[PDB]
Design an enzyme around this catalytic site. Structure first.
Site, PDB file in Angstrom:
ATOM      1  N   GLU F   4      27.791   6.075   7.382  1.00 52.92           N
ATOM      2  CA  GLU F   4      27.599   6.417   8.792  1.00 52.92           C
ATOM      3  C   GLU F   4      27.772   7.921   9.024  1.00 52.92           C
ATOM      4  O   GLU F   4      28.636   8.369   9.781  1.00 52.92           O
ATOM      5  CB  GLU F   4      28.537   5.602   9.689  1.00 52.92           C
ATOM      6  N   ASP F   5      26.934   8.693   8.330  1.00 51.08           N
ATOM      7  CA  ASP F   5      26.797  10.146   8.421  1.00 51.08           C
ATOM      8  C   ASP F   5      28.007  10.911   7.896  1.00 51.08           C
ATOM      9  O   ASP F   5      27.993  12.146   7.931  1.00 51.08           O
ATOM     10  CB  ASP F   5      26.501  10.618   9.853  1.00 51.08           C
ATOM     11  N   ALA F   6      29.042  10.236   7.405  1.00 47.00           N
ATOM     12  CA  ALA F   6      30.193  10.939   6.859  1.00 47.00           C
ATOM     13  C   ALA F   6      29.834  11.602   5.531  1.00 47.00           C
ATOM     14  O   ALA F   6      28.878  11.222   4.852  1.00 47.00           O
ATOM     15  CB  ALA F   6      31.369   9.982   6.671  1.00 47.00           C
ATOM     16  N   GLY F 145      27.783  15.433  10.179  1.00 54.31           N
ATOM     17  CA  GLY F 145      28.837  14.461   9.967  1.00 54.31           C
ATOM     18  C   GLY F 145      30.138  15.151   9.624  1.00 54.31           C
ATOM     19  O   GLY F 145      30.162  16.312   9.201  1.00 54.31           O
ATOM     20  N   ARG F 177      16.016   8.812   9.106  1.00 56.94           N
ATOM     21  CA  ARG F 177      15.738   9.930   9.996  1.00 56.94           C
ATOM     22  C   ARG F 177      14.467  10.683   9.625  1.00 56.94           C
ATOM     23  O   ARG F 177      14.077  11.598  10.358  1.00 56.94           O
ATOM     24  CB  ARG F 177      16.926  10.896  10.013  1.00 56.94           C
TER      25      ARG F 177
END
Ligand SMILES: [Mg+2]
Ligand SMILES: [Zn+2]
Ligand SMILES: [Zn+2]
Lengths: 94, 256, 48, 151, 56, 281, 65
Positions: F4-6, F145, F177
């Protein structure tokens, strides 16, 4: 190096190893894998931050030898292998 | 266990180890990277600093400076490190360049290995005076204590059949990239002592025409140093550290 | 309760009393901006 | 727990509240616990569920031809915290080394009295699912060897 | 007769409040636990004395 | 830890000075003059005056009421000692203090005057900001992130050429994306590092992707940018060729040090008797 | 604003050879061959040396005292 026993069954030994990390833990587990009397051998890190230097072990044998004895033989095998590699490295350098 | 030194350099060494298992090689690499101790600056006492760089930046730059570690005087393989502190002092006045070789060490054996490392630039009327304290430490606690960079790869033999078109191009590429090539009447064998990647035109032949085999228990190691320790002493120190760790684990097991 | 200050432009030392100063300026170049010099005491800075 | 919050990790901030009275603490512990709200009341379906990496790892583990060594199986069992003391019988042997299928490792998570069958999103050949459905319907207790032949 | 989640939460809160200001525990509990934990243990043991009044 | 974008950042890279930043804050204090000749005083307040913060809060102050430069300060530490005339008694305390949730080292002290002739003191405090968990990092292609985990270099994977990634990003965020420019930039950065010549990335006239792939293949690496990687922990070869490259990453000002707020009890509004608004207050 | 002492990736010291690299690059030499001659093999160290911009001289001109 400190050993904190979590639980002890008739053939199962669960313990912590304070002050160590993946380097010694993985080597010890894979050396225990070489023993034919060890049925289960594994380690894990509960948390990479809080338990970074405290892996959890689990050694299960078939009852022929105790898990503590199996760990002792694994450590002795690691010691002997490291000594042999050091001797070979010293011989090859000169 | 056998060793074959591929290349020896004052700052690096390349060798092939045989007869050893994969987690053993990983443990040796990790012990070299994070467990072998060296001398590095841990705390700096600043008297005056008129330079553009801040005190923290200068202290961090001083921590990155390699320092010679006498392996004979101190037991670097011990689980508990000696708390010996070495004081490095500098008194410089601008204008000019401040180098790592201008530091005055209180111990002859503990000095900056590279004396041509710039630290800070001083303008006219700017002076920098401090006392830098250095002590032994492990690479796992901070990257300033790492003796150098270490990595290994599998020793693989790439078999290219003569039925594969343009196999001579692959052979000459392997020869150009410094890889041992063995030529036979049926196929050629390339020993991957370095990183070898096939071109795009040979990707379709990797399924049936070109086959790569992995030598069991053989690894190509590359160990580098920044001058803190000899490149041959690091492996011995790591192996002795592993031996001491095994002995300590045996002692704890007996304590159980 | 006098103190020593450094001029921002000329950089020369300026001494005056902040409590009873009619005007805060450098007597050498006339600059009204001054710098408080760093104390000469030692400080401990951790290397990262 | 991210889908219930609709929270990602590109700079999101969240608020924490500490109840001070015993009644409020008991109400939070009984009514508002995370595990009590797995099923969303809006549509009667799972809300606290797996996400991208969990789905990809499950597919990689449970796909056809996925096999793992004894060391990998033991390490993943220790990592997942599963209460497994002995390994099951190896599914196949390759070069003298035992191997475990990913389906066998995944089956350790499910309860022993659970039976369910359905079609997933990877079904692109309905003719292969038709034989399995017919075999399940005909007997209702199909032999495990027969199912694996036409899996 | 079964307790609803709201009724159970109210009973646990009342018992924890009682334990906080007196009302000694009717069962043996481990040392160092919170009054809420003691009330939860009492509910698990089925020893709670608090009843629920329902409309009739 | 990168879902999750981390993102995951190397510990040794952080310890070597990567993405190291310093945060500056400037405080000001004026010796204001009131009607009737009353004015503020720049001095260390006496313990007998009202509003005394405490003895330890003035430990960094000089005898002129100004903090010494290069002094370590903490929350609510006094920078400029000021006193004010009482309202309708002894003089009150109106010293300028550091924010309660902030700290650092005093960088400079400026002594000057305002337009009305009143004394003006400006104090700049600098704080070292080593990257940690929750620090926002963003690339130039909109991929953003926070740091999910700081991993030691020993546990980090490495390639056959001896390359350890500085940052690790999850593959699940790239194709959703539709960001091919990030992959092209990674390939171009690797090519530029290998060749020594910077790669032009101008719009519609930049270096073609196929040319970059051909150059990467000619340099001795895979055209796709994938390299054989080994697991940091187990030491075994990874079953897939991992895509690795050089991507320009920017550290944003959204740092967890300036965003963490914790309140238990404190000041309340006069009108509503409700807690105030803002981390500063 | 000043060249890093060590490479951010592997910790290899590069600040000693940076000024020679900058001097040779400004003389018209190929930066890749200059990096190869200085022992800069891995592209992470090449990344550190090539992408660095010197800015300390522009900061020294402003006095802070
Ligand atoms: Mg978001
Ligand atoms: Zn002046
Ligand atoms: Zn490097």
């Amino acid at each position: 190096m400190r050993i904190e026993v979590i639980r002890r069954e008739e053939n199962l030994l669960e313990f912590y190893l304070e002050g160590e990390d993946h380097t010694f833990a993985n080597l010890l587990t894979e050396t225990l894998h070489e023993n034919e009397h060890v049925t289960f051998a594994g380690y894990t890190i509960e948390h990479p931050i809080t338990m970074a230097r405290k892996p959890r072990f689990k050694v299960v044998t078939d009852g022929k030898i105790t898990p503590e004895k199996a760990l002792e033989e694994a450590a002795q095998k690691i010691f002997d292998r490291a000594r042999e590699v050091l001797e070979a490295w010293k011989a090859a350098i000169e | 266990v056998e060793f074959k030194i591929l290349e020896k350099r004052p700052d690096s060494i390349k060798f092939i180890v045989s007869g050893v298992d994969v987690p053993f090689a990983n443990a040796l690499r990790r012990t070299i990277l994070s467990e072998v101790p060296t001398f590095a600056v841990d705390e700096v006492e600043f008297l005056e600093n008129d330079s553009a760089l801040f005190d923290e930046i200068i202290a961090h730059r001083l921590a990155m400076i390699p320092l010679t570690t006498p392996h004979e005087r101190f037991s670097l393989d011990a689980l508990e490190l000696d708390d010996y502190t070495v004081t490095l002092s500098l008194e410089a006045e601008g204008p000019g360049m401040v180098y790592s070789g201008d530091l005055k060490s209180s111990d002859g054996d503990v000095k900056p290995a590279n004396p041509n490392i710039p630290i800070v630039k001083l303008a006219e009327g700017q002076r920098l005076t401090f006392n830098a304290y250095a002590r032994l430490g492990r690479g796992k606690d901070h990257a300033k204590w790492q003796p150098g960079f270490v990595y290994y790869k599998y020793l693989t033999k790439i078999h290219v059949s003569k039925d594969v078109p343009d196999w001579e191009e692959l052979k000459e590429l392997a020869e150009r990239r410094g890889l041992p090539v063995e030529e036979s009447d049926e196929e050629i064998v390339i020993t991957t002592i370095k990183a070898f990647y096939l071109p795009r035109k040979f990707e379709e032949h990797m399924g049936k025409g070109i086959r790569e085999e992995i030598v069991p228990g053989s690894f190509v190691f590359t160990v580098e140093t920044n001058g803190e320790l000899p490149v041959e002493e690091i492996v011995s120190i790591a192996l002795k550290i592993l031996m001491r760790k095994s002995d300590r684990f045996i002692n704890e097991l007996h304590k159980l | 309760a006098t103190a020593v200050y450094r001029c921002a432009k000329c950089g020369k030392e300026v001494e005056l009393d902040l409590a009873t100063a009619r005007e805060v300026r450098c007597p050498y170049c006339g600059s009204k901006i001054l710098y408080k010099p760093r104390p000469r005491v030692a400080r401990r800075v951790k290397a990262i | 727990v991210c889908p219930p919050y609709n929270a990602d990790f590109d700079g999101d901030e969240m608020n924490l509240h500490v109840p001070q009275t015993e009644e409020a603490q008991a109400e939070a512990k009984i009514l508002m616990e995370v595990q009590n709200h797995i099923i969303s009341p809006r549509y009667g379906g799972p809300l606290i569920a797996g996400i991208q990496d969990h789905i990809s790892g499950g597919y990689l583990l449970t796909r056809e031809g996925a096999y793992f060594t004894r060391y990998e199986v033991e390490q993943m069992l220790m990592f997942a915290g599963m209460d497994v003391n002995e390994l099951p019988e190896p599914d196949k042997y390759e070069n003298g080394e035992p191997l475990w299928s990913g389906k066998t490792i995944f089956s350790l998570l499910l309860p022993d009295d659970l039976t369910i069958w359905y079609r997933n999103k990877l079904c692109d050949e309905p003719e292969r699912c038709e034989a399995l459905e017919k075999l399940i319907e005909e007997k209702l207790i199909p032999d495990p060897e027969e199912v694996r032949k036409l899996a | 007769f079964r307790y609803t989640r709201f009724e159970k939460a109210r009973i646990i809160g009342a018992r924890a409040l009682q334990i906080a200001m007196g009302a000694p525990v009717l069962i043996d509990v481990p040392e160092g636990i919170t009054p809420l934990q003691a009330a939860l243990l009492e509910f698990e043991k089925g020893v709670i004395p608090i009843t629920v009044i329902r409309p009739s | 830890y990168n879902m999750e974008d981390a993102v995951i950042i190397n510990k040794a890279s952080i310890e070597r000075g990567l993405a190291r930043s310093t945060f500056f804050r400037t405080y000001e204090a004026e010796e204001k003059r009131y009607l009737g000749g009353q004015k503020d005083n720049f001095e260390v307040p006496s313990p007998n005056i009202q509003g005394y913060l405490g003895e330890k809060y003035y430990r960094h102050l000089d005898e002129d009421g100004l903090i010494f430069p290069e002094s370590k300060v903490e929350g609510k530490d006094v920078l400029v000692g000021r006193t004010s005339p009482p309202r309708f008694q002894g003089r009150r305390e109106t010293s300028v203090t550091v924010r309660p949730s902030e700290k650092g080292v005093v960088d400079k002290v400026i002594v000057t005057e305002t337009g009305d002739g009143t004394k003006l003191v400006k104090v700049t405090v600098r704080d070292l900001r080593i990257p940690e968990l929750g620090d926002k990092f963003a690339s130039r292609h909109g991929q953003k992130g926070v740091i999910g985990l700081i991993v030691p270099q020993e546990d980090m994977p490495w390639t056959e050429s001896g390359i350890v990634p500085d940052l690790i990003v999850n593959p699940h965020g790239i194709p959703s994306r539709m960001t091919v420019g990030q992959l092209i930039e990674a390939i171009g950065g690797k090519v530029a590092s290998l060749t020594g010549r910077r790669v032009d990335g101008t719009a519609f006239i930049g270096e073609p992707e196929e040319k970059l792939r051909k150059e990467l293949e000619e340099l001795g690496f895979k055209h796709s940018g994938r390299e054989i990687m080994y697991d940091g922990i187990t030491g075994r070869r990874l079953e897939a060729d991992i895509f690795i490259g050089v991507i320009y990453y920017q550290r944003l000002h959204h740092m967890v040090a300036d965003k963490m707020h914790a309140r238990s009890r404190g000041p309340v509004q006069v009108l509503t008797k409700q807690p105030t608004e803002g981390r500063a207050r | 604003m000043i060249v890093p002492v060590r490479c951010f990736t592997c910790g290899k010291v590069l600040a000693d050879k940076y000024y020679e690299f900058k001097k040779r690059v400004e003389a018209g030499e190929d930066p890749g061959k200059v990096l190869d001659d200085l022992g800069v093999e891995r592209y992470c160290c090449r990344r550190t040396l090539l992408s660095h911009v010197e800015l300390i001289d522009q900061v020294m001109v402003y006095k802070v005292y």
